[PDB]
């Protein structure tokens, strides 16, 4: 069996998709969480200076979604056909594009709060509406069963709701999708034991 | 055989990776390029309001890298092992993260030029150095043969060099990698017939 070590900050953030996948597939791993103080040292040892990274039998993988895709290959989370695997990838990237717009690392709280509130007020409702229309009356975002795109929806929406609690008031179908992901036994079991962090 | 129709603006931009893949695999397709004037109408018909899109026997795929990955599955461009396929994905996303930082759509030329010059002066050299160190003395970025990560390197660097011609003066190994991609017969054949656009 592979010996997995995940390194990230002590937060859900970009590592959480990987953590959900390990939970669903019942894979034991080391969930190494670093303090901000240790980051400068660690950063200088990494080929691209970013986390998360996943060490697999000592070899270092990077890029959260590249890693997530790797872990889901030949599993029920991948997507059931080659084109549905493309749809999974496309939804994940649509979500990731938006999350990547937020100035997470910005130091000036004034401009940071202003930019968060712009994105959440003007851009977020538009994306929520497109996702809701895309989902329509289907059970899951892609195909006839849960995929890691549904996981990423729940993760991303969980963080957006911290800043904008009314985000999904006009989207009961997207709320239902969150609840369905949160109710999957392995995911529910992870949610109830994970460290509690704002982000 | 699949009937492919690619829709994008009249530019290399985000569609070019797909165009290189079709060239390499010797796949005929419709390269539909829209004028800015027609975009409002077309945009309102798309599930996520963005291009490129690829219609495959009438069914619409979106997200440039999702599409690229779909087209390279079960081909020699994918990566030779499952972990090398993860490395391909990770390099592509590292490149894409940086290209996605540029305010391509910004209307105020003053702030746009300032932001381009900040990214190109302060961030670009750092990434170039990380890529150069990652490549080291290997022939290609991943494994022992060309992958679509090498294609995306060449595409992204081609556009960066428009704005910063000295970008690779300190990176002869990255220049060599560009030339090797540009010399692949099917790619060279595409480069010599493609429409000539700034971006
Ligand atoms: C070291 C230094 C400067 O202090 C960092 C500042 C930025 C910090 N990052 C976040 O706060 C953060 C939180 N959540 C995210 C969720 C995302 O989407 C997810 F849902 F995948 C994507 C990116 C996210 C980034 C980490 C420390
Ligand atoms: C309709 C409206 C407002 O006029 C648009 C403005 C922005 C326009 N987009 C670009 O100019 C452009 C060019 N190149 C790119 C290269 C990239 O990386 C690549 F190498 F894949 C990624 C994004 C890029 C975007 C398209 C029209
Ligand atoms: N697209 C990459 C983004 C990685 C990234 O930028 N990570 C941030 C934290 S969320 C980071 O390492 N920031 C610290 C730094 O740049 O010093 C991924 O999904 O893995
Ligand atoms: N990550 C997406 C980005 C798609 C995207 O934002 N495309 C731009 C053009 S490069 C667009 O459609 N802009 C026009 C608009 O938003 O109205 C991809 O790679 O396909």
- Return the SS3 of A118: helix
How far apart (Å, rounded) are the C-alpha atoms in residues B114 and A28? Answer: 48
Strand partners, B31: B6
Residue with tokens 């704002």: A198
Q: CA of B88: which chain A residue's CA is closest?
A: A66
Query: Quick one: chain A helix, strand, coil %, rounded to 5?
Result: 55, 10, 35
* Ligand 2 atom index nearest CA of B14: 21
How far apart (Å, rounded) are the C-alpha atoms in residues B101 and B126? Answer: 14
How far apart (Å, rounded) are the C-alpha atoms in residues A79 and B16? Answer: 26
Which of B56, B85, B93 shows the shortest C-beta gap to A63?
B93
Which of B48, B61, B90 shows the shortest C-beta gap to A130?
B48
- Is A106 in the same domain as A137? yes
Cβ contact A70–B49 (<8 Å): no
- Is B157 in the same domain as B69? no
- Is B150 in the same domain as B162? yes
- Is A179 in the same domain as A81? yes
Nearest of B166, B168, B89 to residue B127 by alpha carbon: B168
Instruction: Decide if A148 contacts B62 (C-beta within 8 A).
Output: no
Technique of determination? X-ray
The CATH code of the domain that includes B136 is: 1.20.1050.10
How far apart (Å, rounded) are the C-alpha atoms in residues A81 and A162? Answer: 35
Nearest of A119, A124, A105, A88 to residue A13 by alpha carbon: A105
How far from B139 is each of A162, B117, B135, CA to CA, in Å? 47, 31, 8
- Is B135 in the same domain as B97? yes
A14: left (phi over 0), alpha (psi -120 to 50) or beta: alpha
Joined together, the tokens standing for residue A66 give 């590249």
Enumerate residues 6+ apart whose C-beta is below 8 A from A117: none
Enumerate residues 6+ apart whose C-beta is below 8 A from B120: B160, B163, B164, B167
Q: Of all helices (H) and strands (E), which one includes residue A133?
A: helix A124-135
- Is B87 in the same domain as B155? yes
To the question of whether residue B50 is assigned a binding role by annotation, the answer is yes
How far apart (Å, rounded) are the C-alpha atoms in residues A148 and A181? Answer: 10
- Is A88 in the same domain as A132? yes
- Is B40 in the same domain as B138? no
- Is A60 in the same domain as A93? no
Nearest of A64, A98, A89, A82 to residue A147 by alpha carbon: A89
- Is A175 in the same domain as A93? yes
How far apart (Å, rounded) are the C-alpha atoms in residues B99 and B93? Answer: 10
- Is A59 in the same domain as A5? yes
Number of domains in chain A: 2
- Return the SS3 of A57: coil
How far apart (Å, rounded) are the C-alpha atoms in residues A95 and A115? Answer: 18
How far from B27 is each of A126, A160, B169, B186, CA to CA, in Å? 36, 41, 35, 11
To the question of whether residue A64 is assigned a binding role by annotation, the answer is yes
Looking at the annotation, which residues of B are catalytic? 8, 14, 104
Domain span at residue A165?
76-183
Separation of B61 CA from ligand 3 center, angstroms? 28
Q: What angle do CA B43, B47, B48 make, to 5 degrees?
A: 70
- Is B188 in the same domain as B176? no
In this structure, are strands B30-34 and B4-9 parallel, antiparallel, or unpaired? parallel
Strand partners, B34: B9
Q: How far off is chain B from A130, nearest CA to CA, in Å?
A: 6
State this model's resolution in angstroms. 1.6
Instruction: Decide if B11 contacts B197 (C-beta within 8 A).
Output: yes
Separation of B116 CA from ligand 2 center, angstroms? 13
- Return the SS3 of A197: coil
The CATH code of the domain that includes A27 is: 3.40.30.10
Per residue, the 3-state secondary structure of chain B, as one string, reads CCCEEEEEECCCHHHHHHHHHHHHCCCCCEEEEECHHHHHHHHCCCCCCCCCEEEECCEEEECHHHHHHHHHCCCCCCCCCHHHHHHHHHHHHHHHHHHCCCCCCCCCHHHHHHHHHHHHHHHHHHHHHHHHHHHCCCCCCCCCCCCHHHHHHHHHHHHHHHHCCCCCCCCHHHHHHHHHHHHCHHHHHHHHHCCCCCC
Q: Which residues of A67-79 are buried (b: 16+ CB within 10 A; e: fewer)?
A: bbbbbbeeeebbb
Full strand arrangement of the beta sheet holding A4-9: A30-34, A4-9, A53-56, A59-62
């Amino acid at each position: 069996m592979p010996n997995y070590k995940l390194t990230y900050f002590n937060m859900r953030g970009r590592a959480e998709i990987i953590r959900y996948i390990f939970a669903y597939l019942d894979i034991q791993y080391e969930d190494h969480r670093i303090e901000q103080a240790d980051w400068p040292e660690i950063k200088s040892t990494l080929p691209f200076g970013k986390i998360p990274i996943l060490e697999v039998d000592g070899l270092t993988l990077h890029q959260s979604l590249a890693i997530a895709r790797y872990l889901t290959k030949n599993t029920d989370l991948a997507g059931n056909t080659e084109m549905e695997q493309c749809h999974v990838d496309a939804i994940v990237d649509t979500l990731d594009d938006f999350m990547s717009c937020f100035p997470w690392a910005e130091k000036k709280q004034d401009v940071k709060e202003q930019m968060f509130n712009e994105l959440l007020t003007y851009n977020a409702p538009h994306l929520m509406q497109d996702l809701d229309t895309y989902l329509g009356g289907r059970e899951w975002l892609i195909g006839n069963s849960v995929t890691w795109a549904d996981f990423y929806w729940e993760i991303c929406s969980t963080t957006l709701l911290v800043f904008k609690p009314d985000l999904l008031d006009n989207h009961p179908r997207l709320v239902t999708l969150r609840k369905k992901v949160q109710a999957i036994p392995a995911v529910a079991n992870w949610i109830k034991r994970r460290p509690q962090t704002k982000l």
